[PDB]
């Protein structure tokens, strides 16, 4: 049923967790509603959305206008609202400070 | 025995994998008898050193005039040769494009 998975390490914010991926806009963010629910005060109540429109299409990121940003590193750079970066198996990206990895299922 | 640990997060490149450090300096290169030997294209043969110091010091990164460089993150940096970088615990370093992060053991 998930096309993917994005894994959050474990670091200051907490322990680690991982979270599935569906077709449609997978919310980042900090309510329990969100796709990706991150309860913490670095994040914002939606902060990054995962779209995905196909299962043989690259999910495509983008950040909602967050507070304190969402940061790729192909190339290292922060992502500024409304700019559109599609993500391959495997990559790391970072949720103000949380460090993500996407994974293809 | 070692009192640090570099990890390499898994990417197109291949697998993850762990790295110990030990008091001194750590080579990180493409070669065979590097300290930290990363077999990958982009990386060069002598890229960067990460030198443990004893008295609970903090580590230096340095970049060693690498062809595709080295950077901090959170927040980003670029690293310079000639430049030391004092390590934090749980740093994360991008030698050319591949993410790894140091752990003090």
């Known amino acids: ?53 196909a299962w043989d299409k690259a999910p495509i990121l983008r950040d909602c206008g967050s507070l304190n940003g969402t940061q790729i590193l192909r190339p290292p750079k922060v992502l500024s609202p409304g700019v559109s970066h599609r993500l391959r198996d495997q990559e790391l990206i970072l949720f103000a400070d949380l460090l993500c990895q996407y994974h293809r299922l």
């Open 1 to 53: 049923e998930p096309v993917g998975r994005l894994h959050i390490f474990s670091g200051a914010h907490g322990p680690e967790k991982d979270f599935p991926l569906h077709l449609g806009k997978n919310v980042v963010g900090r309510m329990p509603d969100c796709s990706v629910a991150l309860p913490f005060p670095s994040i914002s109540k939606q902060h990054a959305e995962i779209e995905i429109l």
